Amino acid sequence: SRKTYTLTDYLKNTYRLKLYSLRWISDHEYLYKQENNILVFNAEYGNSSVFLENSTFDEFGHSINDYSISPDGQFILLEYNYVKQWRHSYTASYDIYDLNKRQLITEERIPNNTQWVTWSPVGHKLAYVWNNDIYVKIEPNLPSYRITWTGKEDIIYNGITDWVYEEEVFSAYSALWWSPNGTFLAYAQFNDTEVPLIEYSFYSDESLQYPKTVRVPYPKAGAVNPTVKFFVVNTDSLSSVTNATSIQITAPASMLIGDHYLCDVTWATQERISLQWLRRIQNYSVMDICDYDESSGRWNCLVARQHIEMSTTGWVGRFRPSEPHFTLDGNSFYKIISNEEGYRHICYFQIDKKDCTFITKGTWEVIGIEALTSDYLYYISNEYKGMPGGRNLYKIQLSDYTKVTCLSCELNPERCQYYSVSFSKEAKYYQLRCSGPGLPLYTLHSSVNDKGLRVLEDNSALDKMLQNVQMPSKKLDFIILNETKFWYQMILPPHFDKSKKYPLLLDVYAGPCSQKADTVFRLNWATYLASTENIIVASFDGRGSGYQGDKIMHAINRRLGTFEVEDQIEAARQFSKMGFVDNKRIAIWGWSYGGYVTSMVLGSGSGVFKCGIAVAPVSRWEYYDSVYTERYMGLPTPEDNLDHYRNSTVMSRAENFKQVEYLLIHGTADDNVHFQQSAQISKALVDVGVDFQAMWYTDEDHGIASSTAHQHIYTHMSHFIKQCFSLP
Amino acid sequence: SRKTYTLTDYLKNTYRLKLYSLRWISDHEYLYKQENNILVFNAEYGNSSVFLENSTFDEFGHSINDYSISPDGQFILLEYNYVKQWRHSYTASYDIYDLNKRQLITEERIPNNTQWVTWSPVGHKLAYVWNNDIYVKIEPNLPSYRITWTGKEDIIYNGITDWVYEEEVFSAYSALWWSPNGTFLAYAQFNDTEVPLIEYSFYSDESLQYPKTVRVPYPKAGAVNPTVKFFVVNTDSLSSVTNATSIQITAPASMLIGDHYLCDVTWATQERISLQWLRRIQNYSVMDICDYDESSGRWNCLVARQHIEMSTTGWVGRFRPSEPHFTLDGNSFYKIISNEEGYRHICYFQIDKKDCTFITKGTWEVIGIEALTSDYLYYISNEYKGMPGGRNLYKIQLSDYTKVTCLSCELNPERCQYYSVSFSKEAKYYQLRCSGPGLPLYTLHSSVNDKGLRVLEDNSALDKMLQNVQMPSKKLDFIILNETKFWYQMILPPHFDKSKKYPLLLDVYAGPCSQKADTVFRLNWATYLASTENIIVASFDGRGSGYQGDKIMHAINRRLGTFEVEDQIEAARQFSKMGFVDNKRIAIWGWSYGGYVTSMVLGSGSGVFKCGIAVAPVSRWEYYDSVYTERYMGLPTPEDNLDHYRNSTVMSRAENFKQVEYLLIHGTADDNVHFQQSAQISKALVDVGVDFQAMWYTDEDHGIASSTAHQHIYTHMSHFIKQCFSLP
Ligand SMILES: CC#CCn1c(N2CCC[C@@H](N)C2)nc2c1c(=O)n(Cc1nc(C)c3ccccc3n1)c(=O)n2C
Ligand SMILES: CC#CCn1c(N2CCC[C@@H](N)C2)nc2c1c(=O)n(Cc1nc(C)c3ccccc3n1)c(=O)n2C
Ligand SMILES: CC(=O)N[C@@H]1[C@@H](O)[C@H](O)[C@@H](CO)O[C@@H]1O
Ligand SMILES: CC(=O)N[C@@H]1[C@@H](O)[C@H](O)[C@@H](CO)O[C@@H]1O
Ligand SMILES: CC(=O)N[C@@H]1[C@@H](O)[C@H](O)[C@@H](CO)O[C@@H]1O
Ligand SMILES: CC(=O)N[C@@H]1[C@@H](O)[C@H](O)[C@@H](CO)O[C@@H]1O
Ligand SMILES: CC(=O)N[C@@H]1[C@@H](O)[C@H](O)[C@@H](CO)O[C@@H]1O
Ligand SMILES: CC(=O)N[C@@H]1[C@@H](O)[C@H](O)[C@@H](CO)O[C@H]1O
Ligand SMILES: CC(=O)N[C@@H]1[C@@H](O)[C@H](O)[C@@H](CO)O[C@H]1O
Ligand SMILES: CC(=O)N[C@@H]1[C@@H](O)[C@H](O)[C@@H](CO)O[C@H]1O
């Protein structure tokens, strides 16, 4: 008498997973948004006060997109007129509000089309980027000072990132870094002057007679890369009519000898900045420590003080070198590094000393350092029960490394196995977030004795609702390949009778350091295909996948479209042997990297698959960007790796496609994985006479996330899979 | 016969239609190529000697694309390195082979990347366009003379046409007109400085890292149009010292008050040129007869002797004011004109007297004037048996307008009802071309007494092959809606059964002055569909169609997307009725304007069609070019016809597509009907939640004519129709 999780349920969000997003405002309080009524919470006791009622601003004029309360609590930034650009960048209008005197500042307003704004870490200063130039406000109503004058669209970028850096380096549009004092303002400067431009047509509304051409500086594999510079401005010494003075911090000599990237920026203390540069050949990286010398007023980055981090098996770090976590005094820090056994662990570094010291060890990996105090270091790893797809919060007694405590392992063994944490400043408190295998559960904790303070959100409203639906179950196990464990998850149709034959959809990503087999709970497309269409949706992490050691993650070094492709097929094969999967009805599909892999598999000729769907997939590595691509493929030169670049295109496998049913999808406005890529694929198929299904999405980009487009693609895809499996 | 007409037959061109292309070189001889040999034939006796052997350019080095023998047969232009551009335009290299010797004039060679070349009507003079500038060579081995210096890519076009003129006006890349004498050289100049550019991505070869953006000056409905000037130069007076002086011939003052175009250029005599201008509001045109003043070296067009063409019911001409045929002395001429009752007949004009004299009348139309001797005017009409879809050659005795003879009606009644003709210069002979309903037949005739000299090609071979195959038959009938008769055709399956029920596909064009129903014989996709899949393929010429009077053709005036659409739906209702049509399986498909009509049809919610295929369809008239669009819709402004531009989009009907299975196809490199038009359609469907099938073709243009692309699309469409009609 129960219904099934239908496509519409997923498409129309019938079952809402609740969340609990707070922002620590101090060591003991946090802000939380409830019914548009911003509240302030006391962590210790749980009581609160409304900080700003929805009521306020009902006569503002425009819709408010986001809020940002200054560290002071005296002002609050009002963001509206939000126009999205890339994955993290966007532009918007801003207004400030004096809380001391319920008023909107009308004088010296932040300009329109501002690219980025940030309060200082303490107080109420402001720094913004308008027209690629950095401006600073000491007071909200006072006129701002101009820090840089070189800014110029699509060429010079100050305080903000260009395309690659936003996407592949900082996962952010910002390139501004305030000191903990608020005294200094460090910023990067990008220069795309010689960076080729990818161009594509944006059609826009019907009303538009002539389509428009978007031109973005985008460096494809091997092209000229943007260059970078770094500066630091003293915010307290800014006069009315006196251009501000930025002191540039050069990169190490080992980086300047060639192309290089700025990878990280971290303030150690009030007068010490940490910088990490990486070579274009992401083999070698160097952390730089620069101190402020009150004398000249310059910044020295002592050469002896440097720290090298290279790799012989592959690239450095998971996607970039790891971030350092300094001890309060700043003379030491902690950083996650690949050890001699190839596993990632916490290393302790002391500034004026050479080599570091590992604090953790084992056949598992530390995902990330979350908090640091004088007595403990808090991190998350997948040690518990040897599950790489599990996540847990641990404690390390700094005076005895052998004393490690798991803080989330036994809170809810049956329900919780994947955790992410959020510590208050100075780590007196911490919020745990469990996202599976059961419904998400948010809890507040005391740090002094690890006491559970209270449940913040347990999704019981969703639980009630779901007890009426026939939900699919998840199996997390592994298979063996040349004496190695490789995990896979299976989303099984409710009432899974392993004495029957079920069709199987292989959901793939399989990109460098990926992980599709894990313990998190999801309400997605696969949930539907399993609940209603009774299809088994499996995902496999083979060579290349991450969080299992460098031997597995680097197996694909300098050879994408190789072992990870083969392993997807081998997993699929062994799934067949299993007495519950119709080996005549096995499909595969993937988005982006998952789409390239899906194409590679369909064009392998294994005969293992009946059909496959590839969404906005890479087809030839020369078409993707320099940073991501080169990190694994090196350069596309004859001296370097040109042969394998040319040996791993989807096009070269066109002929084998005649053995399968292929559906190709792509948004015409994809700025990330250019339409060009799918364009070249279809042409390869047309040139060898192979028939296939196609579908473009006018003006959608990599995410094809516009409500209408989103429901459309998943509807289309469902039909394709239903027909490919002869399912009603 | 057992064997049927397969798709592979159509795509691989298994049963070829022989032909007989000849080029008349004089009053009684013509060239023809056998294999790779150019033979010259004598029309009177039929004897032929070899003019040039396939063994003359083996050691040439380049693959010869075409040849061009000069008037006095002394030289032969060799065309190679042919690189296509738009529909009629292209670039190529050339070499002149002197026949009076055994050499390739290697001195003053015609520059590479030449855009257009042409001999004079007499002798061996040579004019050519290069870099948008005109050059003239009196002798093939001599240094050419530059005629214009204003040439500027995409801006100033001298001697060649811009995109709109090439496609919608002169249907050719050339804008050069030699005078009979060979003395003068009139040319046109286009100024595209203020024309907007349509831009689209061209991905090219797999090796091209960044896609290339193509920009073509192209005016859409209501956009700024290219301007034009006319010139005439005396090529007898050309000194390599001083520059060649061009004389300009302004347009009629009644043309300069607003935008206008040049429509036709025809020389009457040695010193007389005929220029027809058209107002940007295509229902008013003025022909200009200009005479060369030998004393002032000028050209004067007495404003007194201008002729006016006007349309109250629509626009002028079928697609433009028809072409004049001057009597040898230049004092008069015949021109096809819509008479009082609205049918197009031959009119006789005497240069300095008002009005013209209709020398034909009837409820049928003159399709074209082909020749004009001192005693007879030859032309082709569809008078015979009141069949608009039939064509025949007629002769009118100039000294007694009532005496008209039919030169092809009775040649072979049951096999030939659609002729086209080619007269030898002076017209002593004429080659008649029979296109159907039977296999093509080519014959040579003498006009002295219209004696049939001989058969040139009768397709005996193709004929004997088809008897062995089970071919479909064609029915050319008509239905009556109100009180008017509208014709249609039907390609019926082999062994047709009036008691059996076959599915039906509606092949559609339906544009203004189109004719899909006729007596022509064709071997196409429709043949495959009826022969092998037993699908009835019917076409229908409803309102708007041509060759039947302005009552039917102008019905559509300023109202595209209405009657022509209704009439197609209607036709299908009637065919449904006919007891041999399964009203459960009726499909519709069209390309270009047919793509458009097919979409409107599918979006009307009529409930008649189950599925349909649209290829490179127009979606909204504001996206197509000005000259063709404005010709039927006027300007898209509020004071003009903007209301109907906005009420005739494929988009506004989106919702209705939920009731039909739709397949949308388009070449991404389409310069004619910009990919944009389909991109907006898909977005509308997606925005409204309608699932359809899609398919783009990277780098293909309006014709999707590359060998591989062409095969891929007709296969793709075949699977679609086969699956839409539950066909085994
Ligand atoms: C090309 C390429 C690529 C590589 N890639 C990256 N990075 C590392 C960080 C920076 C980025 N530049 C490159 N992140 C990824 C992927 C990826 O393929 N998929 C599969 C996937 N799966 C699904 C279901 C997706 C759905 C929508 C959009 C993308 C999707 N992608 C991912 O999920 N994530 C999170
Ligand atoms: C947009 C538009 C348009 C209108 N149009 C024109 N003209 C008039 C003269 C000037 C020109 N600019 C516009 N000629 C046409 C069409 C047309 O739609 N189809 C259907 C069709 N059908 C098939 C099967 C086709 C196949 C390939 C290419 C085109 C095709 N077209 C035609 O066959 N012909 C010959
Ligand atoms: C967020 C909040 O309301 N905190 C209040 C605090 O201001 C007050 O001093 C205390 C005693 O009543 O109760 C809570 O802790
Ligand atoms: C600081 C500033 O630029 N203010 C103007 C505002 O006065 C105007 O109403 C708006 C138009 O949307 O453009 C800006 O926001
Ligand atoms: C602000 C800045 O440093 N601009 C430089 C520019 O002067 C130089 O000519 C160019 C050459 O690549 O590189 C950068 O764009
Ligand atoms: C050769 C020629 O006619 N050039 C004209 C130029 O004189 C004029 O200023 C412009 C205005 O659109 O159009 C063209 O560029
Ligand atoms: C012989 C002579 O005067 N030649 C000139 C040429 O140099 C100049 O570039 C052109 C444009 O004004 O006009 C003439 O063709
Ligand atoms: C528009 C809006 O947010 N309204 C909410 C209302 O639903 C809620 O019941 C109330 C309780 O404080 O708070 C208001 O802000
Ligand atoms: C085209 C051709 O070859 N015509 C020749 C002609 O030159 C010659 O005068 C005649 C008499 O022998 O024989 C014909 O065959
Ligand atoms: C008349 C002339 O310029 N001919 C040259 C030809 O010799 C050369 O082979 C070709 C490209 O290699 O370019 C042509 O323009």
Coordinates of N, CA, C and O and ligand atoms in Angstrom, one line a residue, chain A residues 87 163 167-168 171 319-320 507-509 511-512 516 589-594 616 618 621 624-625 628 631-632 672-673 702-704 714, ligand 1:
Chain A
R87 N 31.2 29.4 -11.9 CA 30.8 28.5 -10.8 C 30.7 29.2 -9.5 O 29.9 28.8 -8.6
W163 N 39.3 33.0 -15.3 CA 38.6 31.7 -15.3 C 39.2 30.5 -14.6 O 38.7 30.0 -13.7
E167 N 38.1 28.4 -11.2 CA 37.6 27.0 -11.3 C 38.5 25.9 -10.8 O 38.1 25.1 -10.0
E168 N 39.8 26.0 -11.1 CA 40.8 25.0 -10.7 C 41.7 25.3 -9.6 O 42.4 24.4 -9.1
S171 N 38.7 27.7 -6.2 CA 37.3 27.3 -6.0 C 36.6 28.6 -5.3 O 35.7 28.4 -4.4
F319 N 44.2 18.0 -5.4 CA 43.9 18.8 -6.5 C 44.8 20.1 -6.5 O 44.9 20.8 -7.4
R320 N 45.5 20.2 -5.3 CA 46.4 21.3 -5.1 C 47.1 21.0 -3.8 O 46.6 20.2 -3.1
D507 N 26.5 4.1 -12.6 CA 26.6 5.5 -12.5 C 28.1 5.8 -12.3 O 28.7 5.4 -11.2
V508 N 28.7 6.5 -13.2 CA 30.1 6.8 -13.1 C 30.7 8.2 -13.2 O 30.1 9.1 -13.8
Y509 N 31.8 8.4 -12.5 CA 32.5 9.6 -12.4 C 34.0 9.1 -12.7 O 34.6 9.5 -13.7
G511 N 36.8 9.9 -12.0 CA 37.9 10.8 -12.3 C 39.0 10.8 -11.2 O 38.8 10.3 -10.1
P512 N 40.2 11.4 -11.6 CA 41.3 11.4 -10.6 C 40.8 11.8 -9.2 O 40.2 12.9 -9.0
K516 N 32.7 7.4 -5.8 CA 31.3 7.3 -6.0 C 30.7 6.3 -5.0 O 29.5 6.2 -4.8
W589 N 26.4 5.5 -17.6 CA 26.2 6.9 -17.9 C 27.0 7.8 -16.9 O 27.3 7.4 -15.8
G590 N 27.4 9.0 -17.4 CA 28.2 9.9 -16.6 C 28.2 11.3 -17.1 O 28.2 11.5 -18.3
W591 N 28.4 12.2 -16.2 CA 28.4 13.6 -16.5 C 29.9 14.1 -16.5 O 30.7 13.7 -15.7
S592 N 30.2 15.1 -17.4 CA 31.6 15.6 -17.4 C 32.7 14.6 -17.5 O 32.7 13.9 -18.5
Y593 N 33.5 14.4 -16.5 CA 34.6 13.4 -16.5 C 33.9 12.0 -16.6 O 34.3 11.1 -17.3
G594 N 32.7 11.9 -15.9 CA 32.0 10.7 -15.9 C 31.4 10.5 -17.3 O 31.1 9.4 -17.7
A616 N 27.6 16.3 -21.2 CA 28.7 17.3 -21.3 C 30.0 16.7 -20.9 O 30.6 17.0 -20.0
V618 N 34.1 15.3 -21.7 CA 35.3 15.7 -22.4 C 35.5 14.6 -23.4 O 35.0 13.5 -23.2
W621 N 41.5 15.7 -24.5 CA 42.1 16.5 -23.5 C 42.7 17.8 -23.9 O 43.1 18.6 -23.0
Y624 N 40.2 20.7 -22.8 CA 40.0 21.1 -21.5 C 41.1 22.1 -21.0 O 42.0 22.3 -21.8
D625 N 40.9 22.7 -19.8 CA 41.9 23.6 -19.4 C 43.3 23.1 -18.9 O 43.4 21.9 -18.5
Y628 N 43.7 21.7 -14.7 CA 43.2 20.4 -14.4 C 43.9 19.3 -15.3 O 44.5 18.4 -14.8
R631 N 47.7 18.7 -14.8 CA 48.0 18.1 -13.5 C 48.2 16.6 -13.6 O 48.9 16.0 -12.9
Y632 N 47.5 16.0 -14.6 CA 47.5 14.5 -14.8 C 48.2 14.1 -16.1 O 48.7 13.0 -16.2
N672 N 32.7 25.7 -19.1 CA 33.7 24.7 -18.5 C 34.2 23.7 -19.5 O 35.3 23.7 -20.0
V673 N 33.3 22.8 -19.9 CA 33.6 21.7 -20.9 C 32.8 22.2 -22.1 O 31.6 22.0 -22.2
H702 N 27.5 24.0 -17.9 CA 27.9 22.7 -17.4 C 26.9 22.0 -16.5 O 26.8 20.8 -16.5
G703 N 26.2 22.8 -15.6 CA 25.3 22.2 -14.7 C 23.9 21.9 -15.2 O 23.2 21.1 -14.6
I704 N 23.6 22.5 -16.4 CA 22.2 22.3 -17.0 C 21.3 22.3 -15.8 O 20.4 21.4 -15.7
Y714 N 16.5 15.1 -17.4 CA 16.3 13.8 -16.6 C 15.0 13.1 -17.1 O 14.9 11.9 -16.8
Ligands
LIG1 C1 35.6 18.0 -17.0 C2 35.8 17.6 -15.7 C3 36.1 17.3 -14.6 C4 36.5 16.8 -13.3 N1 35.7 17.0 -12.0 C5 35.9 17.9 -11.0 N2 36.9 18.8 -10.8 C6 37.7 18.9 -9.6 C7 37.4 20.3 -9.0 C8 37.4 21.4 -10.1 C9 36.8 21.0 -11.6 N3 37.2 21.9 -12.6 C10 37.4 19.6 -11.9 N4 35.0 17.8 -10.1 C11 34.1 17.0 -10.4 C12 34.4 16.4 -11.7 C13 33.5 15.5 -12.2 O1 33.7 15.1 -13.3 N5 32.4 15.2 -11.5 C14 31.4 14.2 -12.1 C15 30.0 14.9 -12.2 N6 28.9 14.3 -11.9 C16 27.7 14.9 -11.9 C17 26.5 14.1 -11.5 C18 27.6 16.2 -12.4 C19 26.4 16.9 -12.5 C20 26.4 18.3 -12.9 C21 27.6 18.9 -13.3 C22 28.9 18.2 -13.2 C23 28.9 16.9 -12.8 N7 30.0 16.2 -12.7 C24 32.1 15.7 -10.3 O2 31.1 15.4 -9.6 N8 33.0 16.6 -9.7 C25 32.7 17.1 -8.3

